[PDB]
């Protein structure tokens, strides 16, 4: 299973958090299996339904 | 007379053994040694030109 490089997730600037517009407190909860994220949503399938 | 006699304080080597990971010669009197040419002396040698 894929894993995240610590050099980029964890640091004084969280580079992964900067790119993805999140926070390290809102990334450790995910790449360490504490909370889910919504990978993608269906926009039209929700607009008509 | 202090226990810093020159007989136990003179050391020199031409070609002794070397370390495993890096091929630098080892250090100390038990091993054949080799004086450490640190970066501070690198500063002096660079300043000399």
């Amino acid at each position: 299973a894929p894993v995240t490089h610590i050099w980029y997730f964890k640091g004084v600037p969280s580079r992964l958090g900067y790119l993805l517009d999140l926070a390290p407190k809102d990334l450790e909860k995910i790449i360490y299996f504490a909370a889910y994220v919504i990978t993608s949503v269906d926009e039209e399938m929700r607009h008509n339904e | 007379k202090l226990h810093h006699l020159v007989d136990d304080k003179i050391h020199a080597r031409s070609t002794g053994p070397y370390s495993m990971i890096t091929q630098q010669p080892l250090g100390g009197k038990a091993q054949f040694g080799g004086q450490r040419f640190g970066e501070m002396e690198c500063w002096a040698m660079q300043a000399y030109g």
């Binding site: 894993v3 610590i6 050099w7 | 003179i10 031409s14 004086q35 450490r36 002396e41």
Partner: protein, 97 residues
């Protein structure tokens, strides 16, 4: 550390192929993530992975940091051959050169 990575990866492979409840699979994936974490940089997150003698293990990052790292210990300054060392004594009868 490489043995830990290999063990976790093999056990995760066994869990996936066998078919296990998602809690155990998630725990194994977390252990894999933390094992790669320890391999790349031990002690960066959480308590460092410790071996015998109760000392932090030397990961890849710790081999490139500080005075004892490769950069300022083996690259910048090296132990050299054709060298010696001894006590100094005044030589008042010597010439300047």
């Amino acid at each position: 550390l490489y043995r830990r990575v290999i063990n976790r990866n093999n056990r995760l492979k066994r869990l996936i192929d066998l078919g296990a409840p998602e809690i155990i699979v998630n725990n194994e994936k977390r252990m894999l993530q933390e094992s790669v974490d320890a391999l790349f940089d031990n002690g960066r997150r959480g308590r460092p992975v410790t071996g015998p003698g109760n000392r932090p293990l030397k990961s890849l990052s710790d081999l490139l940091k500080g005075k004892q790292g490769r950069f300022r210990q083996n690259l910048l300054g090296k132990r050299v051959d054709y060298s010696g060392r001894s006590v100094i004594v005044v030589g008042p009868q010597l010439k300047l050169h």
